[PDB]
Amino acid sequence: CKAAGKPCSRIAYNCCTGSCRSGKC
């Protein structure tokens, strides 16, 4: 799980919950 609000990139999404936007999950 990843924590929403931290650096994620929309090519690799393994988030807890949500959508990856340039820099935020």
Side-chain angles (χ1 to χ4, degrees):
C1 158
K2 225 280 304 201
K6 263 113 290 288
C8 72
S9 182
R10 202 175 195 166
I11 57 165
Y13 126 88
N14 163 230
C15 294
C16 243
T17 57
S19 60
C20 274
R21 196 273 153 133
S22 172
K24 240 69 172 292
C25 212

